[PDB]
Amino acid sequence: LSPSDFLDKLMGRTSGYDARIRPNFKGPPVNVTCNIFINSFGSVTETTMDYRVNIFLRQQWNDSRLAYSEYPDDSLDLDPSMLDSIWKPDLFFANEKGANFHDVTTDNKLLRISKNGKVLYSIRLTLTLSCPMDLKNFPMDVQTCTMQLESFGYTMNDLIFEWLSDGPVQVAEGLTLPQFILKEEKELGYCTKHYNTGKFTCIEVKFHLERQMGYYLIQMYIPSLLIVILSWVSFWINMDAAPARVALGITTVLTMTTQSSGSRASLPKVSYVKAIDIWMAVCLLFVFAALLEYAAVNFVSRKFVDRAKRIDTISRAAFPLAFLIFNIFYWITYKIIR
Amino acid sequence: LSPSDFLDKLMGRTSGYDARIRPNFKGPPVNVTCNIFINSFGSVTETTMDYRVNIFLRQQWNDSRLAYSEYPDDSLDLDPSMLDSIWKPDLFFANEKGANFHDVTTDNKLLRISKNGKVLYSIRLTLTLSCPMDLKNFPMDVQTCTMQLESFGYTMNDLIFEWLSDGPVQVAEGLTLPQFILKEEKELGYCTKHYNTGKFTCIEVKFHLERQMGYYLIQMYIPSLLIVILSWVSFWINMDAAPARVALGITTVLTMTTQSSGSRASLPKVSYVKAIDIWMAVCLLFVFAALLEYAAVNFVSRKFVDRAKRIDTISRAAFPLAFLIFNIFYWITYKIIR
Amino acid sequence: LSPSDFLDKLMGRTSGYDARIRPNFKGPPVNVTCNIFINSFGSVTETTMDYRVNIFLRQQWNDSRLAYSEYPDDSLDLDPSMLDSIWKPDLFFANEKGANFHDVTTDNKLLRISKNGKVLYSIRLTLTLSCPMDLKNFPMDVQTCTMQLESFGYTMNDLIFEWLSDGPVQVAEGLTLPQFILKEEKELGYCTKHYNTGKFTCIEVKFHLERQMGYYLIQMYIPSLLIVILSWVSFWINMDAAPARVALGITTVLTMTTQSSGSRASLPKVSYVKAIDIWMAVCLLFVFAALLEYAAVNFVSRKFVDRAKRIDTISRAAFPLAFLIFNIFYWITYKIIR
Amino acid sequence: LSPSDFLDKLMGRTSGYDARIRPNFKGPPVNVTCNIFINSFGSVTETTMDYRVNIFLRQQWNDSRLAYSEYPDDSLDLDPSMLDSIWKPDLFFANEKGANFHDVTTDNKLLRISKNGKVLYSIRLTLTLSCPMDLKNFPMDVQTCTMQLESFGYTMNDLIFEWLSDGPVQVAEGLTLPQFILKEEKELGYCTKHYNTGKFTCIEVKFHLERQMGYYLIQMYIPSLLIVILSWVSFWINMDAAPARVALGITTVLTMTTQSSGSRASLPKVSYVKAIDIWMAVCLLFVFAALLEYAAVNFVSRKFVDRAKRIDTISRAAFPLAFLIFNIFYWITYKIIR
Amino acid sequence: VPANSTSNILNRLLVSYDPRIRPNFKGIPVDVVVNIFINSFGSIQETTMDYRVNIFLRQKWNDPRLKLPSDFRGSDALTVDPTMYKCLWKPDLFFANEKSANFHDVTQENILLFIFRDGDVLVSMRLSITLSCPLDLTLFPMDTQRCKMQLESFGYTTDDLRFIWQSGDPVQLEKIALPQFDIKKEDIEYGNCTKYYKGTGYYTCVEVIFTLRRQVGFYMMGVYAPTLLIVVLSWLSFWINPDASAARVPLGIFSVLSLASECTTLAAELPKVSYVKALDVWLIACLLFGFASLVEYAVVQVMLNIPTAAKRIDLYARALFPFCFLFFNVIYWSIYL
């Protein structure tokens, strides 16, 4: 009668239940229809190659030992602290770096039970998962950050995970990201890892993260354009102002180097070229070419005024054109192809 | 009586109390009248999008099992160590990133029981809550950081939260924030989240944080203005000082770029533009136009000197005027729209 | 008689002691004579507004349930592990952010009992307390960082704290702070906070932290003085060399701005102005006025040439005088008046 | 007899051993011979004034209740899990800021026992000890960072520490430090702290750390030397080339200031001067005096140009001489004296 | 016979099992086999000299007290609820070159526990340890470091406990990717060190030595090519006419200052070390080259007070600076390949 004695007879001390034994011992495996509801997605640090999530994990399985008839209500809810007495499928995130629960006023968990023995195990988790990034096209990098569920103590012969059919993964209505644009497309794959000790099940969900061009543009693409335009207008200045144009080119080169160094500093040390670095290098080369143009002018000067002016105007009318066709190539290969 | 025996007969092993059971089981839900008392508010960092608070949470409810008559004292206080044996309603802060209690010389909890069974469970806490911010108008941003109280294990049919009528949210006498001006208008709303499982209750309080413009002003709006004034004084100089004016405009562009870079690096990457970014870029364009005007002067130098000086005077008379009207427009549209 | 059986009769299961009950229940409150022995003091960061301590906290109270006669030795020292069995008064530091014990080879504690029952419970701690600062005069500030020893569960009706008469607060022989010069006069007061739940007692101590000016001086004030003297020496040169003087003043302005930005970024964000900011702004204005002086010289020059020479002389002979009177005013009103 | 029964009879529940009571209760004190084995030394951050270590803290003593006759094996090793059931002497590191064990696959400890009862308790640790530094002679500093073992609960009448006769402190063959050079001479003495509670014992060991100047040299002494050499070469240039020497001196002063700011910032904010600051300031003054010399030249010139050439020659001949005698003074009195 | 009876009569306080006593007490030592699995590798911070690895530490031994009898044939192996790993005997084991090691408990202690018929045991436990490997940076951007992971024992001597690697395939790692370095799956050298701590006795230890071959990509892109551009700009400075006196010194000056700033940045990105780094060699060489351009202009100016001498100086410089720089670059790469 009393819920106290009821639980003591169902799974408590006087029940006979043994959490150290999985259901259907010496029998078929357990199917765990897992689903999650993300709550906070962010902290995507390209330097550490991680992304933090706070998820209301859920794990539903069917163990017959919890079949009852005293209480007629199908769905039943119990105290989280009732959890250490029943079985739980061993579950970890193979791509985790720093993970923890959340305990504030209680252990944030949920134990729900049905009349047919089916169970529901919802627990809160904060995961500093690890997704390696591809930065060949850095500002327009459509990445695929993963979340690899998997079993540790049990194998695929005794424990089989599998996503939920309808609405397996959800997100909070009202979410947003500062740098990225999370997509509704979320592919579901079976990693099903295999070690030497045994065959272990494993689930994976792949989030698509497209980095948007706003900040990187306004911070690194426009300043360099202005710097190269300064190096350009340095053309129309007279041919006798050597300190003028040389200091101009020097300052442009210095600020370009600092800009590129900062861009790299915000990112991890990587060998393969990054589009942003291509842009930094090409603009640096443009300002260096302007400096070399003035140097050629001053070398030809020592009637040479005519040839020097011809060079100056040819450059002032060509360099913009070449820079523009190059900008076309760059944006059309990094926004369309890649 | 031996008050130890009183406690043991009220809730101890001999009483018959089952903390694993919510009060009024299989009956009406529970009404938890929650209220808090803040003690520390700060660490508002837009880079991580969080603010750290210290609160004296409180949870008053009515459990019909803790009604007694032996001791006449209406309001009774007890030892926290016994607080673990009584029912504690589940509760978490959904928008939290990292939480923790504060145990120093004991566990910082409180238990106060009335005669009719009413309870008070006051506990200290520390929450690194999360509040997304809109920096479209950053130095004048009026943000709304929230605190979503909510239950996890129990549904809204078995656990209902709600603020207290009088004195629901308090603050410490003498509180003050470095960069912000906290307000006394604290909205109270019903988030009442609804996941797939069921209707989970949720309480939310919204703080309004009006950023003060002092530091950002004195650090970005004053020096940039001085730089623009340098680019201006580059006008009254005569043409013979070509290197003077070119180096001047160049250095001004450099320092403007560095100012923008730092101001944005101290803040998170975001696509949408920020007023401070507007000022950075527009002062950059101003010094750029000053340098370009000098270049046009030196080019027209090749009778010509008359028109060159005319252009110089026209620029010296106009550019400050355009900058002034723009300064007006900007401060008006970013202190009137707010 | 035997020590094991003695402790068991005193507070063990054989005794009858209940740690869940304060002494003198349903009677007068407990008078706790709390005194602390600091061991380390530092980590004063204006960024987070905290300071880290390491104290041998001590709490002496008189409970009559621990009066023994088997051993005539008055003072008795026991095993820390026996602490949990006796009563303890709840306590916390209201102005703390992170607090931890020090468990190394044991739980660092002390338990010394006398014959009358006068208990002594010394515990080790490390506290990241909080003390908001007034930086209206930053390098020459006289701050007051505090430590609010206060109870949480028990009210002023059942637990009353009070400092010790002689030697309540000590300091380790040989202490010293890197940036500050701690004082020996430590003000003691009663905070005695009153929340809505009840009247919770609270004890306060106020530390006078006087910041010394050595570093800030040699790192910010002297460089700025040299920059302004650079702007000064920009005077003796003739007028025919524009690029020299203009580049000089430009670079002085820029390095002054960079110095001020760095200094402020080494400190928290604040609306009001800091003395260091006053000095930065004044030196900036001085170099800017040197540049404006050169500009007015160039204008007056293009017999006004003697006029420009007189301007240069008047500047070179007055600017240092104005700077000296300003230095006098600044230092005398920030070292005497404040 | 049986090993399990043997343990249960010696120190287990059925033995009769009381861990809460030190050996020789109400008798002569306990002599603890402590010795350590350092394993990883480093992380000496001058900003926090601490050095992190990792030691196999060992503690021997003699308690007669642990004498047996069934096992003739003199040295008997046991299971760490059995450690929690015997007596352990209270111990802590007074100069510690943050400490922790290392629990991996077990809680790393050791319990060895002799026939006479002599115990050995080897445990692993990781201590971020604190040593206040004297940076008056900063790059050549010879710092003495301590490790203060000490008791907290038991007085010097019930617990006495004392270093091991021979081989009290060891180091791992193959150890090395990046910044410092640990010595083999390690002082070993008593500190014997004395609080108001009583006379507590103490053991302190002091490592003499001698910083090596490679990094600081190659990073600050060579570049600043190059800067002053630039300010020197500015001499041989002709006098009519104002912008050359002016901009050169300017940029030299600016880079000197930048370097000195970086140096001062890498270390804590300290009042007393640091030799590195002496060097930065004197090099700054050298280049500033070179610029002042150029200015005096330009003032004297406008056969005053002959006197200007004389001044330039006198400067080119005297600057290196004075810089060299100062270099002598500096190195001789900061390396040979200290 | 239910399974609860099996687990009970096998390992619990309800049966005659004592975990505080290793197998073969006062007899033959324990031969512990071991085998690692590198799941994640990276987060190397040369400033602190550490590298983070998330692994599965597998260790199998023989415990005769655990003996699944032939009474039942359920399997030759057997898997048990991880919560029993704390009941039976676990061998003392610690990574010595460790600074921070934490388990990974999420929804359960991430622990395996197999058992066999003859008594063989196998336990795997996830770990994320922050080891330490003293780096050799005499040649930094091309170094070949050897970061190690030496298991050990603390509460058991070599006379009772004994570690040995797995005969075949002890370490494993699949699709491993690091941004900077590149592991060699073949150079996985492992051996014994058999620590001998004074005062206690001989203790066992088995070490893995990962050979990390850093690549020169990011550095070539960030510190090399910019300085090369700076130096060729310093060269360019020569082609200007010496009559300027203000259009030729700024190039060298700002080149010197930019190289000094690069040196500052590199020293602030890396740990402070006494010995010299090849990167600093290259950088100081480029700095001296800029300084040489500047003193070349100076010698020209002195020779200007003359035209033939100035032309000779400038031409000899334009022809000497690049050749010497190229010879230096050749020798530098041929030395620090």
Ligand SMILES: *[C@@H]1O[C@H](CO)[C@@H](O)[C@H](O)[C@H]1NC(C)=O
């Ligand atoms: C688990 O699912 C498999 C197939 O997916 C099935 O063969 C097995 O019977 C299931 N286990 C149960 C129902 O306990």
Ligand SMILES: *[C@@H]1O[C@H](CO)[C@@H](O)[C@H](O)[C@H]1NC(C)=O
């Ligand atoms: C558990 O019982 C339900 C009852 O219909 C059944 O549908 C389901 O297949 C069983 N197993 C699992 C894993 O849900």
Ligand SMILES: *[C@@H]1O[C@H](CO)[C@@H](O)[C@H](O)[C@H]1NC(C)=O
């Ligand atoms: C709790 O409040 C709800 C209304 O929200 C209602 O069920 C009733 O007023 C309360 N039920 C109790 C106290 O059982």
Ligand SMILES: *[C@@H]1O[C@H](CO)[C@@H](O)[C@H](O)[C@H]1NC(C)=O
């Ligand atoms: C508790 O009981 C009182 C009646 O004594 C009732 O009015 C109240 O709604 C109940 N619940 C709470 C939370 O007070």
Ligand SMILES: *[C@@H]1O[C@H](CO)[C@@H](O)[C@H](O)[C@H]1NC(C)=O
């Ligand atoms: C404890 O006993 C002493 C004995 O003189 C008395 O003075 C004191 O008031 C009592 N209470 C406390 C809290 O010390």
Ligand SMILES: *[C@@H]1O[C@H](CO)[C@@H](O)[C@H](O)[C@H]1NC(C)=O
């Ligand atoms: C505690 O102190 C209060 C005054 O602070 C006094 O009224 C009361 O009698 C004291 N109780 C004791 C010493 O037990």
Ligand SMILES: *[C@@H]1O[C@H](CO)[C@@H](O)[C@H](O)[C@H]1NC(C)=O
């Ligand atoms: C501990 O050492 C002291 C040294 O003064 C000695 O007097 C005492 O007898 C010793 N106690 C022992 C060995 O139990």
Ligand SMILES: *[C@@H]1O[C@H](CO)[C@@H](O)[C@H](O)[C@H]1NC(C)=O
């Ligand atoms: C313990 O017993 C040994 C037996 O020789 C004796 O030498 C020693 O002094 C005693 N005390 C200690 C601390 O070792």
Ligand SMILES: *[C@@H]1O[C@H](CO)[C@@H](O)[C@H](O)[C@H]1NC(C)=O
């Ligand atoms: C490991 O190496 C040590 C040192 O040579 C040796 O004593 C030990 O026997 C070796 N291990 C095995 C299994 O041979």
